Every structure is written in C-alpha cells, then in structure tokens.
C-alpha cells in the first residue's frame, strides 16, 4: 500500500499538471502562424516559449521546489526545461500519425514541419524514436507526472548548490513512483527501469539540442526570431 | 533648377523607400495576431520590430550613411528609429478614419487598438495630432522621403562621434529639400519651415515613448512580450 503523505504528492503533482497543460491548445492561435529552411521557426519558437512558461508553473507546484533558493530553481529549470517539454508533449504525440496533434490541422507537426525550425534530423530522429518508446510504455497519468517532477528534481545538473536538499526530494518521488507501479500498475515489473532509461535518453536529447541551439544563436539573423524568454532559459548566463 | 548630383540623391532615396515599404502589407499576416490592457501588444511589438528592419534597410541606402563608422550608424538608428516609424506610417494613416489602414480589417488600428499596447494617451494624443498635421501638409513623395533621411541624419543625437561628417550629409539633404520645394512644389513658400517643425514635434514624441518604454521594460511580464530586436534598439546599451 501507499502512505497518505505519498499520495498527497501524487495529488498535488496531478493537480499541478492539468493547470499547466491545456488539452484544447486554444492558445496556439496566438503564436506567430506556421509556414510550410527556417520557415516554421517563428511558430515553433513561440510554441517552445509558451511551453517553458507552463513548465515553470508546474515546477512551482512540485511539493518542495518552491522552498529552494532562487539560484537553484533557476539552475534546475535552465538545464531541464527542454527535457520536460519533450516529456509533456508525449500527451499529444500520436502513434498513428507519428506527429504531434494539437487541434489542427494548422497545428499538426510532421517531421517535415519540425525539420524547418533550424534543427537537423540528428536531433529529430532520436526525439521521434523517444516519443514512440514513451508512448508504447502506456504510462498512467500519475506515472507520467511523477517522471516530470523526477526529471526536474535531478541534482547532477550544472549550477546546483544544494545537492542534499533536492536529492532528498527526488528520492522521495522515486519511492512514490516505485510504490505506485507495485500497487496500481498491473504488469509493471519492468516499468520503473524503462522509465529511468527514458531519463538517460532525455539527456542525450538535451545535449544535442544544446549543441544545435548554439549554432542558431551565433547567427543573429535566426537568433532574432526567438523570444526573450527562450534567450534567457537556453542562454549561457549564470 | 536642381543639380544632377542633387537629383541622384532624390532618385536613390526614393528607390530606397519603395524597397523598404510594402504597400500591400502582405507580411502582417506573419505577426502575432491582433486581439481587441496589454492585449494587442504582441501584434504591435511584432509590427514595430518589422518596421525597424525596414528602417535599417532604408538607412543603408541613404547616400553616405553606409560610409559612417558602425558605432555612428548604430547610434543614429538607436535614437531615431521610433521617429522614422511614426514618420513613414503617415503613408497608411487615413484622415477619413483617423486610423492607420494596412489592408485589414484585421490591420485597421483605431485609437482603441493602440491604447492597448501598454502606452497611455499621453503618447497617443500627440502622435495622432502629429499624423493629421503631416497628412494635411500633402507632401510629395520626394519630400516625404527626404524628411526621413534628414531626420535620420541629425547629429544632435546621443552617441555620435563624427559630428562633422553627418552634419555635412544632413545639410546636403536640406539644400536638396529647399531646392525641390522652390522648383517642384507650387505654393510651398512656407513648407520647409513646417516640415522642420515636424522634426521638433518628432522629438517630443520620441522623448515620451522613451519614457513610457522604460516603464514597460521594468516589468518583465510585459518585457518578455517584445522581440529581441526591439530590446536591442530601444535598449539603453552603448
């Protein structure tokens, strides 16, 4: 069984998800429209910028993230944002279409659409394979959310000063995750191991995106297309 | 009569205008859509950002602007951009509607629409009165263009090092302007004086906009809505 304190974590994490994920995607109409070579980068940079704001909102409701120092909250978000956006977009990724479907068709993102925002297939290939591997796991919502808070609360990230406090928080989430799969997921006897692998798969995707973003930001003709938040989060400032 | 060298200035200035002013406004559909309180600021910040790029293109074709040092080209644009945008938008300002008409109706900008981008009527009132005063002058295109290059080429601007070279260029434009009205404008015997007044009216508008932009940029919830170019041009960096 699960503790009452272990399930308040799950409740507050699930409540912190619905708040920051709009299943109607009704705010996409407010982005720079899509165009279908750097076309489509205005749209996707707007999309990503919106996603970062919903990640920050999600983080602030993780039990105990708000109690960290501002330097550590900034530091964890600066290194984990792009991982959590790839993570949370699994909810709109379709195995049938191999695209993300957000209420289009103007918001249906094939590989042809995402190749046009300045990133090579050397990032889009692993990301799409990541998306089917995660969608095939058929995670419950409670498990999808926990993996977000676990991924955010990793201390092996550049810039963290309080390695003891956030590790303590992250371990607490894994134990809630392991208990959840024991009690509530039928046949999940391998699942916690595959999910932890997905964390390591996320790091290979971050490292690549961080590599290709540096090429985009050294070209001011493309860097001026991004939004000020994107420039701050993916920036290299301490 | 006019010199052959005086009319190459007018030719190259007029050619540098059509290039950087699209009378079809067919690139507005690429801005963050309008919404009709800080609504409408996404759109208008995109609009202004696009306008700055067309001003920079115009400047680079002014005869002798490209020969200045990069510090002076940056410095003149940083202080004069917002004046030239107000200037060049006279071409779409309608006296009948008291609005700017750019091929709407989604791109028709009443005062209600422009009050919503974070600026008070303490800026919108003088600006609209400026727009009718300039539209009532019924400037030829040759005179409208010259006033842009004259306004850009002012040396009494913060950050200019070569006061002698650009004053020499600006004076050359005024003499072309005065000759043009002598020879080509019937009844313009007061016109060069009213146009020079418009330059001074432009400075009161700049000073105000610079004042209200400082309030917008000290609020990060609004400053993140602007574009990276806007932040550079209207920024206070040297």
């Amino acid at each position: 069984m699960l503790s009452d304190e272990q399930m308040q974590i799950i409740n507050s994490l699930v409540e912190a998800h619905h708040k920051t994920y709009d299943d109607s995607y009704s705010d996409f109409v407010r982005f720079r429209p899509p165009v279908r070579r750097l076309s489509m980068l205005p749209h996707l940079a707007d999309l990503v910028s919106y996603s970062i704001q919903k990640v920050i909102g999600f983080a602030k409701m993780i039990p105990g993230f708000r109690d960290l120092t501002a330097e550590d909250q900034i530091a964890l978000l600066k290194s984990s944002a792009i991982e959590i956006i790839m993570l949370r977009s699994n909810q709109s990724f379709s195995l049938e279409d191999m695209s993300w479907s957000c209420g289009g068709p103007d918001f249906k993102y094939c590989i042809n659409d995402v190749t046009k925002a300045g990133h090579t297939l050397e990032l889009l290939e692993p990301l799409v394979k990541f998306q089917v591997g995660l969608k095939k796991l058929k995670l419950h919502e409670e498990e999808h959310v926990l993996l977000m808070a676990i991924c955010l609360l990793s201390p092996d990230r550049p810039g963290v000063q309080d390695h003891v406090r956030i590790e303590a928080l992250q371990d607490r989430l894994c134990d809630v995750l392991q208990a959840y799969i024991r009690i509530q997921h039928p046949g999940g006897r391998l699942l916690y191991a595959k999910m932890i692998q997905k964390l390591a798969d996320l790091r290979s995707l971050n490292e690549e995106h961080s590599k290709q973003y540096r090429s985009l930001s050294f070209q001011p003709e493309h860097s001026m297309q991004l939004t000020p938040l994107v420039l701050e989060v993916f920036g290299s400032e301490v | 009569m006019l010199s052959d060298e005086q009319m190459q200035i007018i030719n190259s200035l007029v050619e540098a205008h059509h290039k950087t002013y699209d009378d079809s406004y067919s690139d507005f559909v690429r801005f963050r859509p309008p919404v009709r309180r800080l609504s409408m600021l996404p759109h208008l910040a995109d609009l202004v950002s696009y306008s700055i790029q067309k001003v920079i293109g115009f400047a680079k074709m002014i005869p002798g602007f490209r020969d200045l040092t990069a510090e002076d080209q940056i410095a003149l644009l940083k202080s004069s951009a917002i004046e030239i945008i107000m200037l060049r938008s006279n071409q779409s300002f309608s006296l009948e509607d008291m609005s700017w008409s750019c091929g709407g109706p989604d791109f028709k900008y009443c005062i209600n629409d422009v009050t919503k981008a974070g600026h008070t009527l303490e800026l919108l009132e003088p600006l609209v009165k400026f727009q009718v005063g300039l539209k009532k002058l019924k400037l030829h295109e040759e005179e409208h263009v010259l006033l842009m290059a004259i306004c850009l080429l002012s040396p009494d601007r913060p950050g200019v090092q070569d006061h002698v070279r650009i004053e020499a260029l600006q004076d050359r434009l005024c003499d072309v302007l005065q000759a043009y009205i002598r020879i080509q404008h019937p009844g313009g015997r007061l016109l060069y004086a009213k146009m020079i007044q418009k330059l001074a009216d432009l400075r009161s508008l700049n000073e105000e906009h610079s004042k209200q932009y400082r309030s917008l940029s000290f609020q990060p919830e609004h400053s993140m809505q602007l574009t990276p170019l806007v932040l550079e041009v209207f920024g206070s960096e040297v």
Binding site: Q53, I56, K60, I74, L77, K78, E232, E237 | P220, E221
Partner: peptide, 9 residues
C-alpha cells in the same frame, strides 16, 4: 535572469 526571477515570484 529578469524574466525567470519574475516568473518564480
């Protein structure tokens, strides 16, 4: 990090 601080309240 002006916007991040502001976004974290």
């Amino acid at each position: 990090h002006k916007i991040l601080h502001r976004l974290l309240q």
